[PDB]
Every structure is written in structure tokens, then in C-alpha cells.
Amino acid sequence: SFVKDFKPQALGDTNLFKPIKIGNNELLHRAVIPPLTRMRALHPGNIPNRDWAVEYYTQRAQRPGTMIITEGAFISPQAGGYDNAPGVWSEEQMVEWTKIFNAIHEKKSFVWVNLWVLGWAAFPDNLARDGLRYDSASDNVFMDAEQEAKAKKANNPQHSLTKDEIKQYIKEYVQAAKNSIAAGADGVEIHSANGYLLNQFLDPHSNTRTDEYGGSIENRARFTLEVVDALVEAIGHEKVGLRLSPYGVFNSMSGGAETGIVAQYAYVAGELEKRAKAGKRLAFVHLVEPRVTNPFLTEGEGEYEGGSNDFVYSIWKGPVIRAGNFALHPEVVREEVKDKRTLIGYGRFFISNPDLVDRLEKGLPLNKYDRDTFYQMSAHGYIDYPTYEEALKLGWDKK
Ligand SMILES: Cc1cc2nc3c(=O)[nH]c(=O)nc-3n(C[C@H](O)[C@H](O)[C@H](O)COP(=O)(O)O)c2cc1C
Ligand SMILES: O=Cc1ccc(O)cc1
Numbered sequence: 060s061f062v063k064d065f066k067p068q069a070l071g072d073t074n075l076f077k078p079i080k081i082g083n084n085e086l087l088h089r090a091v092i093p094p095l096t097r098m099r100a101l102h103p104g105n106i107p108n109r110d111w112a113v114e115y116y117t118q119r120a121q122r123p124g125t126m127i128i129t130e131g132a133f134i135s136p137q138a139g140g141y142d143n144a145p146g147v148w149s150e151e152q153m154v155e156w157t158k159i160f161n162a163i164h165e166k167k168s169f170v171w172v173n174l175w176v177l178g179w180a181a182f183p184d185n186l187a188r189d190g191l192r193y194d195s196a197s198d199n200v201f202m203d204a205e206q207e208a209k210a211k212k213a214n215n216p217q218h219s220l221t222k223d224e225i226k227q228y229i230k231e232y233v234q235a236a237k238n239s240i241a242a243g244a245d246g247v248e249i250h251s252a253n254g255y256l257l258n259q260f261l262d263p264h265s266n267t268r269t270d271e272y273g274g275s276i277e278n279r280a281r282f283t284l285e286v287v288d289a290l291v292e293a294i295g296h297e298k299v300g301l302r303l304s305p306y307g308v309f310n311s312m313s314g315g316a317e318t319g320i321v322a323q324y325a326y327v328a329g330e331l332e333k334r335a336k337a338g339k340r341l342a343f344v345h346l347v348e349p350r351v352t353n354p355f356l357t358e359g360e361g362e363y364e365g366g367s368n369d370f371v372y373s374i375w376k377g378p379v380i381r382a383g384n385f386a387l388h389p390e391v392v393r394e395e396v397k398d399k400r401t402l403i404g405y406g407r408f409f410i411s412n413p414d415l416v417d418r419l420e421k422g423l424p425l426n427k428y429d430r431d432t433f434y435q436m437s438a439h440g441y442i443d444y445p446t447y448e449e450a451l452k453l454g455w456d457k458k
């Protein structure tokens with residue numbers, strides 16, 4: 060069924076359809092497909108699903124010039140924690156990723172691998188079985204109730220990373236970046252948002268360390284910036300991007316309740332622009348809008364109207380991607396794109412609408428999404444969403 064009770068508006072006359080250059084890529088529009096974990100990866104091996112992945116990315120790369128950010132990809136086994144999420148550390152995975160990247164490039168679109176490390180969001184028992192640690196910034200603060208519950212059951216206490224163990228994660232990031240780029244990826248997006256490892260260090264609630272990785276704005280941000288510095292020196296600054304969620308509360312992050320959250324991120328943004336002048340300007344900065352502080356709550360819930368991301372624009376002067384409930388609000392996108400360096404990320408509706416860009420340009424009805432197949436091990440709810448034409452033939456509008 061099409062989304063009922065929604066007035067679609069054509070966005071063909073806005074900047075959403077004026078090309079832009081992000082890195083080495085020349086996009087033909089600014090509707091970006093943000094990272095979306097679907098959990099179809101194969102176990103054992105965290106292998107990209109061999110039966111359905113290529114088709115999935117291929118469907119959503121039909122509109123030429125589209126920029127696609129792959130689903131979260133584990134840089135290594137320790138950075139992992141979910142049986143069905145893909146990784147980019149083994150030869151057996153890179154062989155799969157290549158087929159996807161080629162399928163994507165052939166449609167004339169672009170792909171960026173999102174580097175993922177779970178921190179305290181990983182399953183402790185899944186880590187105990189394979190003989191891995193349950194990492195995080197600290198060891199006296201746990202994500203929640205059932206996480207500290209699984210920690211004990213598996214006799215796998217939450218571990219406060221040591222300086223040498225952080226250095227290791229930085230070595231795996233580089234390797235993963237290198238594998239992805241070697242397999243033909245256009246670039247990689249450092250995932251430093253939604254309460255994962257790097258965000259756990261960034262947030263003052265999950266980071267109560269005393270060494271140079273906690274204790275102040277400058278220290279809580281050290282990890283993220285070292286990773287940025289490392290990937291910039293290894294594959295080029297035009298092939299790297301950083302994702303942040305200043306006001307997110309997902310996974311026990313502080314959000315706007317922490318008075319120093321704006322300063323924490325203003326700092327990071329400041330360090331980027333700094334490097335930008337030094338010649339090394341990241342390809343872009345990706346921001347999750349306070350319009351969505353929790354990606355698990357329906358469109359309109361968990362909105363934080365006490366803060367804004369606009370401050371980033373006074374510090375960083377490169378491309379900025381903004382994502383969060385923009386598909387059902389064309390009126391807000393029309394205003395946000397009047398800025399010449401802003402890109403719009405459409406998550407949940409790029410899941411259900413494979414031809415989303417066309418529907419945005421022509422103001423057509425959007426396919427409602429099925430939340431139940433977001434993480435199912437099936438093709439249903441993954442690759443069987445119809446395009447507008449297919450929907451008409453199937454009679455989704457009622458004669
Ligand atoms: C099913 C699902 C999977 C997601 N997977 C990821 C992910 O792997 N990495 C990430 O950074 N964000 C992820 N997100 C968050 C989205 O990138 C996005 O910020 C969020 O969905 C808000 O956009 P939307 O309102 O257009 O869906 C996911 C969201 C959903 C609903
Ligand atoms: O729903 C899965 C998910 C994964 C990573 C994120 O960052 C956010 C959501």
C-alpha cells in the first residue's frame with residue numbers, strides 16, 4: 060500500500076536535483092541513501108548475503124549519480140557482535156562486496172562503505188562464544204538492563220579499552236578502509252554516531268575515563284579524530300567522511316540533556332575545518348537530525364526541538380548530509396536544500412521505495428514500509444518492494 064494521508068510534492072525545481080561533487084564522485088542529485096542495517100549477512104563469516112545483496116543495492120542504484128552508503132560493516136571480529144551483519148576484513152567478504160560495488164558502478168551510481176564498531180552495543184555472549192571481549196569506553200557504566208544482564212551470564216564483563224587496544228582498533232579501521240577501496244569502493248564513512256564505540260568515547264555519560272581518552276572535550280574526541288587522521292593518511296581525504304548524531308539518545312547516549320553536547324561536537328567540527336585549511340578536507344560530514352533521536356521510533360516520535368544542528372554550518376564549510384524523517388516532509392527539505400552544500404539522506408523510505416529519487420522529483424506516492432522485515436532473513440521486505448510502475452500494475456492505488 061502507498062502511504063495514505065500524505066500530500067506528495069514534486070521536488071524537481073529545488074536543489075535536490077542540482078548536481079554536486081562529493082569527494083571524487085559527481086552526484087547528479089542530492090538524495091543520499093544513508094547506511095541501513097538489514098541483517099541479511101551470512102553466518103558463519105559475516106558474509107554479505109550471496110543470494111540477495113547485489114539485487115538490493117542494484118535496485119536502489121537505478122537513478123544515475125545516486126550516492127549509496129553501504130549498511131554498517133564490521134572492520135574486524137572484535138569490532139563485530141552481530142551474527143548477521145557484514146564485515147570487510149576477510150577475503151571471503153571482499154569477494155562478495157566487489158560484486159555489489161560493481162553492480163552499483165554499472166548502474167552509474169557511487170558506493171561508500173560505512174565502517175562499524177559496536178562497543179557496548181554488541182552482544183556479550185555472541186562475543187564470548189567466539190572468544191572476544193565486550194568493549195566500551197568505560198567499565199562502570201553499562202548501556203542498559205539486559206546488556207549488563209547478558210554480560211554476566213556469559214561471564215564477559217564490559218571492558219574499558221586500554222591505549223594499546225585502541226591503537227589496534229585504529230589499525231583495523233585502516234585495513235578495512237584499504238580493503239573497501241581495493242574492492243572498488245568510492246570511499247568510506249567513519250561511523251561515529253548512534254551510540255557505538257566512537258560515540259561511547261565522545262559522550263560524557265559513557266566515557267568516564269581519566270587518561271587522554273576521557274575527561275574533557277578534547278579527550279573524549281581523541282579516538283574519533285585519530286581514526287579520521289589515520290584513514291586520511293592511508294587512502295586520501297577525498298575518500299573519507301564522518302557521521303555524527305549530536306542530539307541522538309539511541310543506545311544510552313546523552314542527547315540534549317547534556318549541556319555540553321553542542322560544545323563537544325562544535326569542537327570536532329572545528330578540528331575538521333582546521334584540517335580542511337591544512338588541505339585535508341574530508342569528503343563530507345553526515346549528520347543525523349534531532350528530528351530523530353532514536354531510529355526505532357515511528358516518524359514524529361522522539362523529536363528533540365530544543366536543539367539544532369545548524370551550528371555545524373558556522374564551523375565546518377564542506378558538504379553536509381542531513382538525515383531524519385525527510386521523506387514524509389517535502390516542505391522541510393525544500394527549505395533545507397536552499398543551502399548550496401546540503402544533501403538529504405532518506406533512510407526508512409529508501410528501504411521501501413527502490414525508485415525513491417524518481418518519486419521525489421515527480422511528487423508521486425511513496426510505498427509504506429514494513430518494519431517487520433527490516434531485519435528478517437528473507438527476500439520478502441528486502442528486495443520485493445515495487446517501483447511506482449510495478450505498483451500501478453499491481454493495483455496499489457485502488458481502481
Ligand atoms: C532498519 C534500519 C537500519 C539502520 N541502519 C543503520 C546503520 O547501519 N548505520 C547508521 O549509521 N544508521 C542506520 N540507521 C539510521 C539511519 O541512517 C537514519 O539516520 C534514520 O533511519 C533516520 O532516517 P529516516 O527517518 O529517513 O529513516 C538505520 C535505521 C533503520 C530504520
Ligand atoms: O537498526 C540498526 C541500526 C544500526 C546502526 C545504527 O547506527 C543505527 C541503527
Ligand SMILES: [Mg+2]
Pocket residue numbers: 451452454
Ligand atoms: Mg491497472
